[PDB]
């Protein structure tokens, strides 16, 4: 039961930046790595695909690709001079497109494809071709501004897909929940004065962009109350995210009445990610997906699209991504998470949990969110 | 410009486990990595050495190697059957020597060399051949128990070094400060009932061994009050460690009056390490080294040895290790940490810092350090 | 546009040996690689599959998997104690199953799957489910003897496939053409005294097994004249292989009238392979496949199965394997081989070509093919 | 006995091109590699250094670095606009400097250092600071033209070093023996009309540059008879090289009377190299080094410099490089070549050897070389 579309294309795994040691450009005092290049490597997303295959999950999904984003679709958010600058740099072996936004040769075409998968996933779910969808969109989108590449993002994938969906289906209320561990600054900025898109970011306080918390950035004018930042304390794990979901996200969704929920799903909150300091395990991602699927079922006829964003642990992202897809599809594979029990033991102690919970209660009050129970 | 001995052997970088994805052994659901093997890779330690060379710092250090640890030295802490067991598995091409303790072909002889470098570094500093020393001892030592390999450690390098030092030189009070992000359980266990060795561990609360905090474990009988665990909240960074150093570590060292300070220096509290959740930058490790070098100058005649332990960020461990060595030597290279400013902006907010600070005040009071 | 079945299982790409530098086991003087492990890596086979997907060719093929080979199937060629021995070493985390035959954790079950894909590919073609087939059977099979793993091969995939086919379908004459650059010693040995299987090996003279040429080894008793070795001079390329195909292989197949042709298709004769010294490009493999598909259409009702064997250039095997599959399917993708023109310019000069040609004329005459 | 200078700098191992699969630029149909990048990787040269260290050889050599090449030194062969174009591309994250000549960020400074090590090695040997020298000059030099980067080479290291040595010491007769498996086209072109430099290339017929043999290219006018190409048949190994050394190289050296011998020492003729089809083992390189050391001792007061060029087998180049340095230093380590015996068995058969030998006899006759025996 439940029909889940899995939007995937092998060519998304061929995007590759020049030499980097994690996030640091090679050059100067940064030695080229012998093996592992840029943090946003193909391997993180590849290993997820490979585990879906060997576990039997891929066979139970509707595996689909899609055409690349048209220039028309891209131009709804990005200017033509940005497209031209990107293509030119892409045609000259790659280089630096923005702040922490290195591209490689042919990255332009691959970024168009990534955007296209997101466009197509929202389309398929709005058209009723599937109940929900997972789009393995690499390179990612959540940090990209209209006029500026950043945080490994070159097009604003989700915003492009939403604008295309509005043009084609006339959906009026879309909620974007971004549980990537970093702040979804691209989605926030694009929809900041808009009430047709509710953007919620759970992120590690001050991680990326560095030093940004944003609790008081709730949107402006027409968009006031339709952006919500939940800056979680570094070191939090399962309980911190469960409390955020229950006290902030679910109430915010209840009030907004989404016709479609899009999840910007990074897995970089996992307990072994190099690019954040949070302590999630695969069952945390499973539980967040269960809660958002339920919200989608109550508000949006089940219409839910999960778009892959970050996740930089080659070893562990596969197990987290697999838990999300199992929950979307309602299929339980024989896969057992070999780090689950270990990560359980590393969780914050009761005093730390109490401290974070109290902050979240205060934040819910500050946002004016009523603690109601779910209903039809 | 002090005299710093740098103990290093290229062959320590040749120890390699079987296929792993981070800490997970390949097999079952864990696919073999296309490139990046076990977390405890040669590359983290090699890249420190490479940056030490390209910066020119190596030319300002006293470069040394050492013989492998003798059976005599190893046998002060490990039984003969452990050595036998280890060697057999090593000669057979490797495998699992214990819990999270995989070994590869020849890992036995390489582990003996790692231990030997630790032995030699303490010796050189105690003999007056250098003011202080850094030992690039891979594989690491601080989790290894007398008859149980664990946490990627196969001999208890520091314990072996200390027992060897005591036999040869007759040093009476040694302080071991372990700022590796994980609990120094091996050092703690070996010296738990002893007052001639003060063991202090700074670690992420519950990280490794998983779920272990340990604030209440202060030693027993003769050792009571000569073990200190400071379980820091996950997510803490520079201020949390500076507060732990000022409130607990330095007062503890003052009270103990060590004649030698050994640091179990893991860099895995760095802000981009996969194996912990702490937020240190290179200047944090610089600052901790300055604080401990000062304690060593006050009580130990400058006698400080830093033994390299963990650190699993290939990109960032080199900058942190270099900061330590710059501080030990008193030489500042041209190297500039390209992540430092970024990491400063990611630090805990004031409320989180205050929360951790109050916790450290209470722990300092529990330890009788007020 | 013919009907081509592509047998593939992602799990075949999860077999991985312990640490090796190319073919050398790590240990002693061979330092662990910073990234690039054993020559028989997942990446060569994975990159073929990735290019098949990005080219869109996969959408024009009949994609299939298979059950692992049963004990019954394996036991037609291998003894139970071999299976036991293999499994024990696999469950223990791997090691050396034979001479140049390292295995990793779970390699036993993965080798059974590799064999299963070969069994299924022959079955599908014999049952009329496809006109022809390609099996991405990793680990490979052509060097494995009944009770001796060697040359990175742990079961004799093709022999197991053939024996299974004979039991189920009752095919009487099978031709095995092995254009892997190394000698197909396992296939040769198993069928040496048999006339129901014609084994032909094209290989680099003396490459692997090292020093073996074998022109004189034509089979014995009932098998006499049903084994042909063509030991090509190292350094030969396209013309050497085209001459071997026209003068020896095609006449041999004509004489034998196979009812099924199986190709042991290694790509290790490619011009940038580390494990041989030959100079083939993707159009050479395209041409050899066209020639054998034609022989199969003439005698075997089109029944041709290509089993993937060697190929150790990550960069270039994908283009060569794609050319084969394009030829089998009759579909031409948009893919253009970026090394082809370069390799054409590197070919043997006319004097070297003439030298090799005269050698092949004489060998053809020795074989009674004039 | 014998004092061997080993010119090395760790920073030479930090030169790294953008993503390549062997020699193929990533992009289009060439997928980015998961691990191993460009063929000219740091690892080949690093593993040689590591083996020198663990074997005890490094401790028995005079380990030295040197300043980078000055613009003055570079300008003796390269134009200022070439230096400027290189630096600009190097400062912008790298890219393509020529045909099969990709550079990375900071490659300019590292290439200057590589040239500087070569300059310094010739200087040290001409000054009598050591009997002979080995320079681990990465990136390599032998393919670089004055006006054009190629074959992974960005400065003409050996030519730069020779021109500097002539300016500083006034050496009049330098022989460059290039046993890298590819044609030393840079050295050939620069000295093609010169009789003060004898350039000899042993190379696989038609390998790199592709299709070039060059037996009839013997130099012109003043340089006629002071360039010699020995195009060996692909597939040849130990005997083919021994015959070439005995029938061509030694006689050519005898006639020329070098005051200094420089060896452009690539190890890409090794039996497992991806970038050529030849079958040398470490004892082949040992024997070639012994013969050239002897020639240097008879003609040049022992003055011999070996400059690292190619070699693309991570596994095997270390054992070959180690054999050369053992022979230069006269120190025999405990290292045993684990592929030696295997490669012995793969050698060409007697008919193939006879075919190549006869070609070499005919070539010696064509060059007008008399088969004399060595003497003082
Ligand atoms: K977020
Ligand atoms: K909004
Ligand atoms: K610690
Ligand atoms: K104690
Ligand atoms: K063959
Ligand atoms: K036969
Ligand atoms: K040459
Ligand atoms: K000349
Ligand atoms: Zn992220
Ligand atoms: Zn640690
Ligand atoms: Zn082969
Ligand atoms: Zn070369």
Tab-separated table of C-alpha atoms and ligand atoms in Angstrom, chain C residues 178-180 182-184 201-203, ligand 5:
chain	number	residue	atom	x	y	z
C	178	UNK	CA	37.756	-16.153	-24.564
C	179	UNK	CA	39.090	-12.719	-25.668
C	180	UNK	CA	40.009	-11.678	-22.148
C	182	UNK	CA	44.741	-13.676	-20.230
C	183	UNK	CA	44.667	-17.417	-20.875
C	184	UNK	CA	41.282	-19.033	-20.049
C	201	UNK	CA	41.588	-18.498	-26.068
C	202	UNK	CA	43.005	-15.333	-27.562
C	203	UNK	CA	45.644	-14.075	-25.165
E	5	LIG	K1	41.700	-15.407	-23.421
